[PDB]
Amino acid sequence: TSVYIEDVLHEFSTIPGVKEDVVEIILNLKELVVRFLNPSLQTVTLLLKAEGPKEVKARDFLPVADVEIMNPDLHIATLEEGGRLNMEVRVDRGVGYVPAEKHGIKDRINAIPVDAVFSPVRRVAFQVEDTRLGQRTDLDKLTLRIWTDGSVTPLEALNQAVEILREHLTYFSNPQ
Amino acid sequence: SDLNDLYRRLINRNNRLKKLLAQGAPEIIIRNEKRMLQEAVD
Amino acid sequence: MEIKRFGRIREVIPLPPLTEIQVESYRRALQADVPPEKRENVGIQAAFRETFPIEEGLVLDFLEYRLGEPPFPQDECREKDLTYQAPLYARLQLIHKDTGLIKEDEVFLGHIPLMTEDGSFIINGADRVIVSQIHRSPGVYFTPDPARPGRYIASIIPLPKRGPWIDLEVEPNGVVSMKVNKRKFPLVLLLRVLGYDQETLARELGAYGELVQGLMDESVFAMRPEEALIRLFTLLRPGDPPKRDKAVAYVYGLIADPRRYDLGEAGRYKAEEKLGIRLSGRTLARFEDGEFKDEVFLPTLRYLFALTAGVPGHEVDDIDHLGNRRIRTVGELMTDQFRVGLARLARGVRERMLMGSEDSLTPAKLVNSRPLEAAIREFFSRSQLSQFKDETNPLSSLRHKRRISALGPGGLTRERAGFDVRDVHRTHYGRICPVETPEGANIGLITSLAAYARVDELGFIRTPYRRVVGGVVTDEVVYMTATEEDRYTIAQANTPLEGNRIAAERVVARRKGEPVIVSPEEVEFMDVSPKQVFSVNTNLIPFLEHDDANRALMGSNMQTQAVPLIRAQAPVVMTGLEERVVRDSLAALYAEEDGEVAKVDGNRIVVRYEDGRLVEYPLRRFYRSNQGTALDQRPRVVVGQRVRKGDLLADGPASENGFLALGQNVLVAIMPFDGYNFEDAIVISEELLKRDFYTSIHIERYEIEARDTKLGPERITRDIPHLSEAALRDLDEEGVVRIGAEVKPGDILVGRTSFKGESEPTPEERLLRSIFGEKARDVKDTSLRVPPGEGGIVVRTVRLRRGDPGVELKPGVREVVRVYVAQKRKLQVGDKLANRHGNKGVVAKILPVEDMPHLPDGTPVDVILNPLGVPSRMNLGQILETHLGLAGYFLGQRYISPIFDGAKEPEIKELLAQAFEVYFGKRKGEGFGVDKREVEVLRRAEKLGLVTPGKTPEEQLKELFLQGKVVLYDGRTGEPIEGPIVVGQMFIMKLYHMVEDKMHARSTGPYSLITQQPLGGKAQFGGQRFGEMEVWALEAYGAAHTLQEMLTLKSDDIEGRNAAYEAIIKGEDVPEPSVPESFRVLVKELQALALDVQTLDEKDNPVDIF
Amino acid sequence: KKEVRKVRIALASPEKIRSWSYGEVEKPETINYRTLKPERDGLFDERIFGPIKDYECACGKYKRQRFEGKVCERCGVEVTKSIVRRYRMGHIELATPAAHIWFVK
DNA sequence: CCGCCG
RNA sequence: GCGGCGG
Q1: Which of D26, D30, D99 has the CB atom closest to B4's CB atom?
Q2: Distances from the Cα of A126 to the Cα of A138, A145, C878, C928, angstroms
Q3: Is C974 on the interface with A (CB under 8 A)?
Q4: C142 touches C316 (CB < 8 A)
Q5: Of A56, C735, C904, C932, which is the most buried if we count CB atoms within 10 A?
Q6: Residue of A27, A130, A143 with shortest CB distance to C692
Q7: Got the DSSP string for A88-140?
Q8: Sheet harboring C132-136: ordered strands across?
Q9: For residues C70-95, b (16+ Cβ closer than 10 Å) or e, as one string?
Q10: Any bridge partners for residue C748, and if so which?
């Protein structure tokens, strides 16, 4: 949801000894898929800082005991020499899509808000095939295949969705 | 608004004429002023 | 990703240096890179020698012109509003009739602008372009008579403009007419004046034309020779001295009027060939020996008698034939004004030759830089020809760097006469793109030049053709002059060839703009490539061959308004020039020689060539384009890499991987939605915004100046008379605003302070200041605030204090402050995008991936183009690109299809077939078959005639995919959409049309002081005009008050608008407008003058407006 | 006498000229620098045209809206705002007659 | 025609 | 004032 580099004031800047631009970077961070474990983890702030000749990968974030990064080899940046890169990336648990202009997170007066990509699924598809059991041939065999980044599991999702559905069904209770 | 400058002109000459009438009235002067005068009004 | 290209017409020679037109022009213009020794003496040097030997006896001669030390460097010129000019002097030496030749070895007389490596100039801080020009090539031609369908008239056109414009008409009822400046005189008269006697004349001239009887017409004036010279003077319309004032005759001799264009080719070309044959001197120029020689006048009439008579050749001149129109390269345009300056200078130096004391005059006395600077200066900064470089994106710049205009000096062509010129003429073939012209008024008048089209020695746009003797085609090419193209029979390049030999008996060719089927033995020349027929800009549309020319234009022009998207993607399907555009345009940075990479900073790339050298290439980080677009160079090379000569080191503003990219390739379904894609609406998937697919960075350059009033210098400090500290935060630096700060509408960008209500302190504001705090700073708050609309993030700041390093600070101007503000442009509802074929449209609704059209396999589409916009407009090309684009998705491969030679319908189905094994092949293995949904749409497909009844769903779907259509489930209902729908990867772009420029919403604000109007200009906006067109609109409606309201309550009735405002504040009913201040003001305006304008009652009586 | 139905253009009787007139401008005195206030019998004098201020008079005897149509006892100043100010006209008495260029050229 | 930028 | 550009 938000990031902050030490010598950068605006998102449209450039950091010495670093190929990628601030925007090429924050772009790559939204591709970062982290995974919390308990509600007590609403807003985590990962910290990372490496120098010199190296390739920053999402694995270089200093571990946070309760949350895990299933996105390890994601390329974050490349550093020539004297490439001083230190940054703090704010991460949250949310739902749906949210424009960096909608939330406007301000941990530090010089940090830049990023766009929210909460949906933990990339693609869903359902198929209806011919019958397996029964006394009639006109029947449905629904099998749906789901795809997740890693945060939660195909099943986890399915269930939550199933719940949300049910949850709404009940709203047909009190008339007026 | 510019019109005043012209308004001042007319006022001036019209006035200068009132005086140029009471002081003494040398013909050539009376007309040379009426002239300017007529031109101002325009 | 594999890159396959389907071209079968062997492209024989690589495209030329696209900016060559401008580049070389200036080179040959100011031959300033090589010693005074090298031959090329046109332009500068030529214009120099033209007017340098000054013979007032006074003798000042030219030696060498040298120049070269650029005051400052490129960017500095931009950062400081400096015009990037080189310094130019030249050795001159003045001789005397007495003993003595003082040579003042240097007089710097001017500062001429320079030419960037890209081809642009930097006049005052900004980059501009000198657009090329066209006109009737100063020569001689013969055009049919105006109304009289009978005979034709002769024209003799010489420029510059001051020189005469001669015509030769023949009206048998009494005269042979020669006109100069609108007056007619006996053609003979002048003839005699030259020596041509009735006898010799008529006999060699009147061999076959009785018309001659019209010349031997003088049995009275034709018997007096030199006296006719005097007789012709009488002819001049004004009373002057009979003798020597032959100046007017002197004028048509050898100097000023006729043209001093290069002896041999400039005019002489239109001589030798078109008429007569030899040119003594440069023009009908000769005042030598007292007697004159005009080897020109007689033949012009010699061809008149030929034309009107037999068939000496069919002399009828088609005006537009490029063989009679020249293009004015910058060099020529600039060199033009230069000699105009040379002349203006030589004007005063002759004056100072008589004012002369003695031998003591040389540099100073003879030379004054005044004329030449104002001259040149005027061109580059005042001429209606050099303008603001359209740099929406590189391509844009490049076109604007190469188009031709008709309007200009005015002598060439005007506005109200054009129906004839506007047409793409026969000759424009491979010389003027027939598609590059702009829509609306000014069409066909201003157009960009062709692919291979290159300007020759004297302007006629030459084009390349291939020689072919017998049934054999060469690899030898020749750039023909429009005229010379007609002599031969050229054939198309689509003509089948087995290698170096023609292929069919009946092969296409075009004689003289006429389509003719010719034989292998008759083909003398063949086209180089289809490309040459259009422009660069045009040459970018994928399947142009299937697109109506009319829409194709929209398509070409559109690309020029493309905007630099952060993530730049080259077209899934390209023409084959993308690489070059970026190349020849200078967006990307290439590697000079072979070698290895040293440093790959995000600011500079340092490489080590294998030749013992190591250079540092700084990357323009994030510069503000002329149009306000991001211009960064992102290195695409890693530390220590062996680079090939001419390899992309970094990508340009819109070029990635060395390819031109402007917008992105999105998956698109081509069908109708509720209505969100009604007329020309386009639907977009939230999913796009998510991966920052369409995002442009933008910059606005706000500026403020600390003026020097006689009331007290305006200071720029953190101090603001109105006491607020919360708004002073962002403005940390005393006076300036902090970089990285978030400026919103109404915030202070820069602070400034000037003196009170003009001259005197207010006697009413001296009592208010004294009550609460007499010691209140008498200075006022005049600060550069964030203009309503928006700002964003401050990213660069420029201040120019006292001790100016090398900047030209205007007078009165104490110091200047510039503030660059940026922001991110994410695609939103009001934004407008478009494809290379001409389908333009705005975003109607941003749909949640959730319920938008998805394919069997989870993959949703990105955009839905309404099908209905394809039939009326004729641009199949897009539907094609889409098909190929569909293979590209599942085949993961980009293709390159040439203009007329590109991919073909069979081959695409071939790759599509391959694509079915990827899309559906993984489907079979992954373990699942066909949906009951897929079956259902297949039923409606077979009953539709799309599939061949009787085959397996497998087979079926394949045949259905091949057509370019797949199945698609709603997404909202998950129910299929009865009937296959075509989908694919289509290359579409976002245009320089943010809605940022689209919503001035006004409530209340500023009024003009002299005239009562809600003009804007500050934190407040202007209210739209109502015009009478729009009043009538209201009138018809019978919208009385709605109209009354417009005229008074909303505008002029100061007091009225007041009552209204108040009323509305009270939730009351607006007051009744009594008299418009316009009514009352009229009464008075009419009282002020005689007329007693009196308003009346029912019964003719008084009434008071006042 | 309610609705304005007809408008008339007629020549101006000198008597009527003085009729619409309130005072006569007698001196080219626009505004003296020291005091933003107009000079005397100048172009911007307030008696000839009216009150330079909003609903108060020259010296301050009557300053509100309760006595709106009453003229002050010591100096003639009846007022509403600064706009009933821009509705009155003044005249200049010309020595020897001049003519309307409009009626002659 | 109406509109907007430099 | 002049160039450009949207419909």
Answers
A1: D30
A2: 18, 6, 31, 11
A3: yes
A4: yes
A5: A56
A6: A27
A7: EEEEE---SEE-HHHH---SSTT-EE--EE---EEEEEEEEE---SSS-S---
A8: C325-328, C132-136, C403-405, C446-448
A9: eebeeeebbbbbbbbbbebbbbbebe
A10: C785
Of A112, D84, A171, nearest to C795 by C-alpha is A112
In this structure, are residues C7 and C896 in contact, taking their beta carbons and an 8 Å threshold? yes
Nearest one of C485, C322, C318, C527 to C404, comparing CA atoms: C322
Same fold, C1-6+662-694+827-991 and C16-137+318-463+529-587: no
- Phi, psi at residue C707, to the nearest 5°? -65, 165
Tokens of C316: 């009828």
Separation in Å, CA C973 to CA C218, C465, C853: 99, 60, 10
Closest CA to C296 of C410, C212, C209, C191: C191
The number of C-alpha atoms within 13 Å of C15 and in the hemisphere containing its C-beta is 23
Q: What is the DSSP letter of C84?
A: -
Packing angle of the helix pair C330-354, C20-29 (nearest 10 deg): 20
C987 CA, E2 C1': Å apart: 32
> Which two tokens mark C154?
């002769």
CATH of region C464-528, choose from 2.30.150.10, 3.30.450.70, 3.40.190.10, 3.40.449.10: 2.30.150.10
How long is chain B? 42
Fold assignment, C16-137+318-463+529-587: Rna Polymerase Beta Subunit; Chain: C,domain 2 (3.90.1100)
Task: Sketch the domain layout of chain C as residue ranges.
Answer: 1-6+662-694+827-991, 16-137+318-463+529-587, 138-317, 464-528, 588-652, 695-826
- d(Cα D63, Cα D79) in Å, to the nearest integer? 9
Backbone angles phi, psi at C555, to 5 degrees: -55, -55
Q: Residue C729: CB partners within 8 Å, gap ≥ 6?
A: none
On the question of a cis peptide bond just before residue C158, with omega within 30 degrees of 0, the verdict is no
Please state which CATH number belongs to domain C138-317.
3.90.1110.10
Residue D2, classed as helix, strand or coil, is coil
Instruction: Determine the residue of chain C that is closest to A9 in CA distance.
Output: C740
In the three-class reduction of DSSP (H, G, I as helix; E, B as strand; rest coil), residue C847 is classed as strand
The closest alpha carbon to C26, from C101, C87, C138, C116, belongs to C116
Rounded CA gap, C665 and C514, in Å?
Answer: 41
Q: Distance from residue C828 (CA) to nucleotide F6 (C1'), in Å?
A: 18
List the CATH code of the domain at C695-826: 2.40.50.150
**Is D11 within 8 Å of C1092 when comparing Cβ atoms?**
yes
Nearest 5°: phi and psi at C284? Answer: -60, 60
Write the CB contacts of C523 (distance below 8 Å, at least 6 apart in sequence): C468, C471, C489, C490, C491, C502, C507, C509
Tell whether residue D93 is among the known ligand binding residues.
no
Nearest chain D alpha carbon to B9: D28
CA distance to partner chain B, nearest, from residue D97 (Å): 8
Residue nearest to nucleotide E1 (CA to C1'): C1029
Q: Provide the β-strand partners of residue C986.
A: C666
Nearest residue to E3 via alpha carbon and C1': C1024
Residues whose C-beta lies under 7 Å from strand E? C 388, 440, 628, 700, 997, 1000, 1022, 1024-1025, 1027-1030
What sign results for the dihedral spanned by CA atoms C532, C537, C543, C544?
negative
Q: Which of D104, D48, D38, D53 is closest to D76 using CA atoms?
A: D48
CATH code for position A47: 2.170.120.12
Nearest CB to D6 within list C1089, C1091, C1096: C1096
Q: Which residues of A touch C639 (CB under 8 A)?
A: 53, 80
Please state which CATH number belongs to domain C588-652: 2.40.50.100
